[PDB]
Design a protein around this ligand. Structure first.
Ligand SMILES: CO[C@H]1O[C@H](CO[C@H]2O[C@H](CO)[C@@H](O)[C@H](O)[C@@H]2O)[C@@H](O)[C@H](O[C@H]2O[C@H](CO)[C@@H](O)[C@H](O)[C@@H]2O)[C@@H]1CCO
Ligand SMILES: CO[C@H]1O[C@H](CO[C@H]2O[C@H](CO)[C@@H](O)[C@H](O)[C@@H]2O)[C@@H](O)[C@H](O[C@H]2O[C@H](CO)[C@@H](O)[C@H](O)[C@@H]2O)[C@@H]1CCO
Ligand SMILES: CO[C@H]1O[C@H](CO[C@H]2O[C@H](CO)[C@@H](O)[C@H](O)[C@@H]2O)[C@@H](O)[C@H](O[C@H]2O[C@H](CO)[C@@H](O)[C@H](O)[C@@H]2O)[C@@H]1CCO
Ligand SMILES: CO[C@H]1O[C@H](CO[C@H]2O[C@H](CO)[C@@H](O)[C@H](O)[C@@H]2O)[C@@H](O)[C@H](O[C@H]2O[C@H](CO)[C@@H](O)[C@H](O)[C@@H]2O)[C@@H]1CCO
Ligand SMILES: [Ca+2]
Ligand SMILES: [Ca+2]
Ligand SMILES: [Ca+2]
Ligand SMILES: [Ca+2]
Ligand SMILES: [Mn+2]
Ligand SMILES: [Mn+2]
Ligand SMILES: [Mn+2]
Ligand SMILES: [Mn+2]
Lengths: 237, 237, 237, 237
């Protein structure tokens, strides 16, 4: 299977698999059962912002999710990515729905990664910023039900003609170029990601969530990973 | 077949195909016969720097090549890239040798492209910086004789284990991710590229040169494009 | 006597001193009488964007002003800044009103300057971005009627608590740190500036305009430089 | 007195005031007696690099110092800068010598600070990079014995005409523009600083060290702060 490290914006509580009894943000390391979570007050129909950061000095993965004029939610977890992910990876966004649904619209997404060599202290870096998505975005790899173009946004999951989100949907978008996330021969390594989203649902219980993830370069949506699996894992192990 | 826009650092004069009688830098628009050139005092064995810039406001492609403590060579050409290249392209470096040779070593390469929407005025951007190249640089597509790893450098053309250049060689390196170079519905579009090189040759007359180029995404080294064709064109038309 | 280089967004035509008979954007080099102008379709009440760029390779100062979903206006002028401005300067925004008025509200302002050494080929750079202004913005030098705080915006000229513009007003805002705009020992040098503005007026003829300028570090609003002088020049010579 | 937050590269152990019995790097919060330290293998005559980082999500100040092809030293400390420093500050570098001496040469220095609004989620930023220091660097405030120009470097402490470092010297360099380090109404605040240095001494025990610091905007060298006080504190409390 693929190797996944992700930050999830979980909108639906699946208490039988470790989720707390309320929407939450979490840090997932090779498992959908978050290693750490924090309560999240998701606002249906409002544009939110998620910021993820990691640096090899502290080797701590943190994330903060918030809405304009509102208290934010934050979660952090100490993890050595050199022992979890392959040297080269691809980064992306994923989302899913199951019995319950919601729109999983991405309005913007930026990412920056830097690697400083230990031998010459020279830096290698990558940065990309999307504030508008095109109908034919060649620098993005769309998987599953993900689509771009409508209103210049990226719709990770299926949305019908009348604008209603569909259930049992899963979709992801990965940046085309592989990213050198870590190198034993580097003095300092770090990355940051930011994305704005719009989660809207008709029912009282929206599902299932959105996640920023990092994985092996040839990663694909695990078959049947709709619902609680967030298009990231093959099972709930 | 391929669509090419490039800035050439032509070290060998091929006066039979439009080249001036001296090393020069030039702007090539869909043809190896530069639309504009400038005399270049290449210094065999010294590390040089090349800077290329373009913006849709002025629709002018300019380049400056220089060596520390020496007069620089500059060349500019008016050109609307919207009417020359396809919307999406790939950027890279190319180099070749023929009867005569030279090392076509790249010590660093950076690139930045920005596109501003005409509707929301928001910007999309891409930036990458290579100050060290590794044996397995996954975010680079290597073609022909290009290799990476030795001394953390990118050798565009064939060189022995000691550093001796070989003739009849051609190689290119392209950034993995496609770049959205121009968009009709964009207020301003621009890009810049910078690369440091080391051209060293044992013979009196080195050849054939190095070039920074922009092409269709599926661009490949044209058959037989060694020597004077710099691995960019199929013929000298 | 200050040394001024500026890009003006001239809303009121003063034909007695060289202005064309319509709103326009122009490049002013040590004189309010623009060296080059372009027709500008100012839209009263709407937020617009102005982008200014200059690079030592081409030695050309260009600017583009536009409003979402509308054609833009562009003006360019070839000028060697090392022969016009002192090596060190301060950058800022200025605006004024006279018999007629308008709000000269700045919603955001960014600037980036780079100087690359000719001996070591290394670069010095400065970048600042203001997407929100505070009541006490310590990194900004406010002159005349300029104030910060109201709705997180920078009001260059006097406005009432409700938003009504006042006549006979002049104000400027300069970045606190001096900028090394040019250095003889530099291979390449360049800068870019961007700002969003909101010009609204109750009368049929708004005045007088907004300008992005570069001046000697100790520059101040010339005595009586309200109205047509845009707070930049002592007279209309 | 001033309010100081700093990262010290302490080359001389003063065990009577809390220093460990070996050169070290430390985090100083309003006191020369570091809140946290780490063993540092300083290499006399070699160019080293220091990287400092801080972010409001983890509220952790970290620093890493190293030399090419050698293990690095790292120190991290939990601290909420919002409760230690004033809203606006100035950043700089300081160094000193006492009975024993060393050259406290700075070859490069960069800094970046970002503040994201909680009501608009828009960010304000500042970035500066010095790879070359000029004899008259107007964007730098030099204090005490600090000088610039010699070989394009910044000499924090006095060096004789023969190139020998002098004892009982103290000097600092602060960036001209004040920096908005924290803002209650900001969702995320962060900053990073990097600088290369060259510490050389004929002595068997060089002294006293270099430090990157953040202080009140009107900060000046405390009288008599040579030696173990690193030009940052008035006493060793
Ligand atoms: C029949 O009940 C079980 O299945 C429904 C529907 O599950 C699908 O839809 C949800 C929401 O989109 C996805 O998260 C799932 O992966 C499926 O795709 C669940 O809603 C039920 O959950 C409720 O009951 C559980 C058992 O007590 C509890 O743990 C949950 O937190 C929730 O209260 C239930 C899921 C069984 O795994
Ligand atoms: C026999 O002479 C012709 O061929 C040689 C060798 O050409 C190959 O090597 C060069 C240098 O690496 C490459 O640029 C070519 O593409 C081939 O790979 C050339 O050196 C000769 O050029 C000289 O003579 C020309 C006159 O015929 C003159 O125009 C050139 O400027 C140069 O002085 C020559 C090339 C014929 O096309
Ligand atoms: C009495 O007329 C002259 O003065 C008025 C008022 O000038 C003040 O207000 C304007 C607009 O805010 C500022 O630009 C000035 O600097 C003063 O502060 C001007 O409006 C008049 O201009 C008109 O008439 C001119 C002469 O025919 C003509 O050239 C202008 O284009 C305009 O049509 C006039 C200005 C004399 O200098
Ligand atoms: C007489 O000894 C005391 O003073 C000398 C000189 O101090 C000055 O120079 C040093 C080095 O440049 C600076 O750090 C000081 O601030 C003064 O400017 C010190 O070298 C002595 O230190 C040694 O002895 C101490 C007492 O046992 C010990 O704690 C130190 O670690 C060191 O071994 C000494 C300092 C008294 O405070
Ligand atoms: Ca869940
Ligand atoms: Ca040639
Ligand atoms: Ca006018
Ligand atoms: Ca000490
Ligand atoms: Mn969960
Ligand atoms: Mn040529
Ligand atoms: Mn005018
Ligand atoms: Mn100490």
């Amino acid at each position: 299977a693929d190797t996944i490290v992700a930050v999830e914006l979980d909108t639906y509580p699946n208490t039988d698999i470790g989720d707390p009894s309320y929407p939450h943000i979490g840090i997932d390391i090779k498992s959908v059962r978050s290693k750490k979570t924090a309560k999240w007050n998701m606002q249906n129909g409002k544009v939110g912002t998620a910021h993820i950061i990691y640096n090899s000095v502290d080797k701590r993965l943190s994330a903060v999710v918030s809405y304009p004029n509102a208290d934010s939610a934050t979660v952090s977890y100490d993890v050595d990515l050199d022992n979890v992910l392959p040297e080269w990876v691809r980064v992306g966004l994923s989302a899913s729905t199951g019995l319950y649904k919601e729109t999983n619209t991405i309005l913007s997404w930026s990412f920056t990664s830097k690697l400083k060599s230990n031998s010459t202290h020279e830096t290698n870096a990558l940065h990309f910023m999307f504030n508008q998505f095109s109908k034919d975005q060649k620098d993005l790899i769309l998987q599953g039900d993900a689509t771009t173009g409508t209103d210049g946004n990226l719709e990770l999951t299926r949305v019908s003609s009348n604008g209603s989100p569909q259930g049992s949907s899963v979709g992801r978008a990965l940046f085309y170029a592989p990213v050198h996330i870590w190198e034993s021969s580097a003095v300092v390594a770090s990355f940051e990601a930011t994305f704005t989203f719009l989660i809207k649902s008709p029912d009282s219980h929206p599902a299932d969530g959105i996640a920023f993830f990092i994985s092996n370069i040839d990663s694909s949506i695990p078959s049947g990973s709709t619902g609680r699996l967030l298009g990231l894992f093959p099972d709930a192990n």
